[PDB]
């Protein structure tokens, strides 16, 4: 991996993404597949395009380092295998339950679908969204 | 085998091999095989080295042979006594001092060149080290 600069840039990008958004979710592909990669990514593409980065890089001093800048509650999610999915278009989109669905339909696990932050929530399969 | 096509004299004195080389830099090519060890490279040995290095490279990129075996080394046959004049020229040698670049090489990666020169070095009787085309 490259030194300081690139990482910093990445962090900045992540922060920016966070700023332009609201709802998010988590996923932990402990035994996932690149075929199953093309369900979530595919979905994202369908929704609009490339913008939605899965950004699997949940270090205590990388993705957690950018957490102090925007939405401080995500620091506790840091440990273990995780991939943060930030949403841009539409306030509280359908992408939260999507992960859960994927998990259900053969993907071993999905970080126990604990979710992220809209009312500072935790592990709840919230069907109530704008539709 | 490398050998002078014509000469003034058939037989040369033994002489001595003290001093360092003049052909010290990698003049032509990019990489060089620099004789650390003092001695004399016979023509045959040189040829062998060349074969090794050319083979190694796979005729990709050019190779130079800086040393030339210009000195005729004589021998007496077996069951011959010490007088009766100086013996006949069995082979030709290049007196190598420390510093003499023996082979140069370009048109290759560095690693490949090094590998080639390892093989070449094996052939040779003298200790040899890898060198590069230095600026100035």
């Amino acid at each position: 991996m490259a030194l300081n600069l690139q990482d910093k840039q990445a962090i900045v990008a992540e922060v920016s993404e966070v700023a332009k958004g609201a709802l998010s979710a988590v996923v932990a592909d402990s035994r996932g597949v690149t075929v199953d990669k093309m369900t979530e990514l595919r979905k994202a593409g369908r929704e609009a395009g490339v913008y939605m980065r899965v950004v699997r890089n949940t270090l205590l001093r990388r993705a957690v380092e950018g957490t102090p800048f925007e939405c401080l509650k995500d620091a506790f999610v840091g440990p273990t295998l995780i991939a943060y999915s930030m949403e841009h278009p539409g306030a509280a989109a359908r992408l939260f339950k999507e992960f859960a669905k994927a998990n259900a339909k053969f993907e071993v696990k999905a970080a126990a679908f604990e979710g992220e932050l809209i009312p500072a929530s935790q592990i709840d399969r919230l069907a109530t969204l704008p539709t | 085998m490398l050998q002078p096509k014509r000469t003034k004299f058939r037989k040369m004195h033994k002489g001595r091999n003290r001093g360092l080389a003049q052909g010290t830099d990698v003049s032509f090519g990019s990489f060089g095989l620099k004789a650390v060890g003092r001695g004399r490279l016979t023509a045959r040995q040189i040829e062998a080295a060349r074969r090794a290095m050319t083979r190694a490279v796979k005729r990709q990129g050019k190779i130079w042979i800086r040393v030339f075996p210009d000195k005729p080394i004589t021998e007496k046959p077996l069951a011959v006594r010490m007088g009766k004049g100086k013996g006949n020229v069995e082979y030709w040698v290049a007196l190598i001092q420390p510093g003499k670049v023996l082979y140069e090489m370009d048109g290759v990666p560095e690693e490949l060149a090094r590998e080639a020169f390892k093989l070449a070095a094996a052939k040779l009787p003298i200790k040899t080290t890898f060198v590069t085309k230095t600026v100035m």
Binding site: V35, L41, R42, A44, G45, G49, V50, K105, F106 | -
Partner: protein
């Protein structure tokens, strides 16, 4: 959706019913019979076009038959009748064998969009272009 049991993409032109010389043992390696790749194979083939190789999933289960869903034919065989020249690589950079325009490539691209694993069509188009280049056809942008 289970993982690797015995699924593999391996067949020549879709019009050629029951290919014994090209595929032969490969399609009937497992318990699936040779008779399965003709009646069931040409059912979906007649709905579109013949003379083109098209891949298909061969998830061989224990219960005789297998589930299958056809995908999309390659740009390889497409770039011959549509492109012009039927040859390609060997000496691409030394001398240009053939050449395609971008518009045509783009057009070709969007028909395959069902099979492609791309977010935007532009990306797909560029991939196609790249493929063409690799094959040995300098794009006329």
């Amino acid at each position: 959706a289970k993982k690797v049991q015995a699924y593999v993409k391996l067949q020549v032109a879709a019009g050629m019913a029951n290919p014994s010389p090209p595929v032969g043992p490969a399609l009937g390696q497992q318990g699936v019979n040779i008779m399965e790749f003709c009646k069931a194979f040409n059912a979906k083939t007649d709905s579109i076009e013949k003379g083109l190789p098209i891949p298909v999933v061969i998830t061989v289960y224990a219960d005789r038959s297998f589930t299958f869903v056809t995908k999309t034919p390659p740009a390889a065989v497409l770039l011959k009748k549509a492109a012009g020249i039927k040859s390609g690589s060997g000496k691409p950079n030394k001398d240009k064998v053939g050449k395609i325009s971008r518009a045509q490539l783009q057009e070709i691209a969007q028909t395959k969009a069902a099979d492609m694993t791309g977010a935007d069509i532009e990306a797909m188009t560029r991939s196609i272009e790249g493929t063409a280049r690799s094959m040995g056809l300098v794009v006329e942008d």
